[PDB]
């Protein structure tokens, strides 16, 4: 049913580019850099740190996701607190180091951002 | 007392930095470095140099005068 409806309605749409103007995908360079917007008025500090990661299709994404799960995520609302398995989460709860900390694995076609974001 | 967290209050100052491994240690070291050295020397020289020039003049004068003082005076033995 979906295929028939798509043929009925979506058939007209075409993949030809006017005047043979075809967009080209461009690999993106990852530059180690630091951008610090210092606004001491703001109540809490947000820091995001990442390293270049695999693309969507790279088989390494799964082990990196496992490692990030090992690192874990913590928010002050979390009930587990000190006993949480994640060493960073346990330490943050015990010392109240951070309101929230999370690990992200952002993946694009050829590059990705692998790291963590912590508000403290 | 003096620690990074509470040193001062600053707002709305964004700083962009690059990794050391992504940038050259000596960028334009001579093409830009020598003109900057010349500029700094041009700025400093007028203030710095003159006193040492005065010192050189005083030193030469003193040395020559002491040498002259040791030298014999013909008039002493005229008689």
PDB file of N, CA and C in Angstrom, chain A residues 1 50 52 65 76 83 96:
ATOM      1  N   UNK A   1       0.825  -1.201   0.000  1.00  0.00           N
ATOM      2  CA  UNK A   1       0.000   0.000   0.000  1.00  0.00           C
ATOM      3  C   UNK A   1       0.862   1.254   0.000  1.00  0.00           C
ATOM      4  N   UNK A  50      35.435  17.049  23.001  1.00  0.00           N
ATOM      5  CA  UNK A  50      35.263  15.942  22.078  1.00  0.00           C
ATOM      6  C   UNK A  50      36.556  15.691  21.322  1.00  0.00           C
ATOM      7  N   UNK A  52      37.769  13.643  17.505  1.00  0.00           N
ATOM      8  CA  UNK A  52      37.193  13.186  16.251  1.00  0.00           C
ATOM      9  C   UNK A  52      36.816  11.718  16.368  1.00  0.00           C
ATOM     10  N   UNK A  65      30.610   3.234  21.534  1.00  0.00           N
ATOM     11  CA  UNK A  65      29.370   3.389  22.285  1.00  0.00           C
ATOM     12  C   UNK A  65      29.415   2.596  23.584  1.00  0.00           C
ATOM     13  N   UNK A  76      22.210  15.577  38.678  1.00  0.00           N
ATOM     14  CA  UNK A  76      22.002  15.712  40.115  1.00  0.00           C
ATOM     15  C   UNK A  76      20.707  15.037  40.547  1.00  0.00           C
ATOM     16  N   UNK A  83      26.771   5.201  44.756  1.00  0.00           N
ATOM     17  CA  UNK A  83      26.905   3.785  44.435  1.00  0.00           C
ATOM     18  C   UNK A  83      26.848   3.500  42.940  1.00  0.00           C
ATOM     19  N   UNK A  96      29.754  16.305  44.731  1.00  0.00           N
ATOM     20  CA  UNK A  96      28.845  17.259  44.100  1.00  0.00           C
ATOM     21  C   UNK A  96      29.583  18.096  43.057  1.00  0.00           C
TER      22      UNK A  96
END
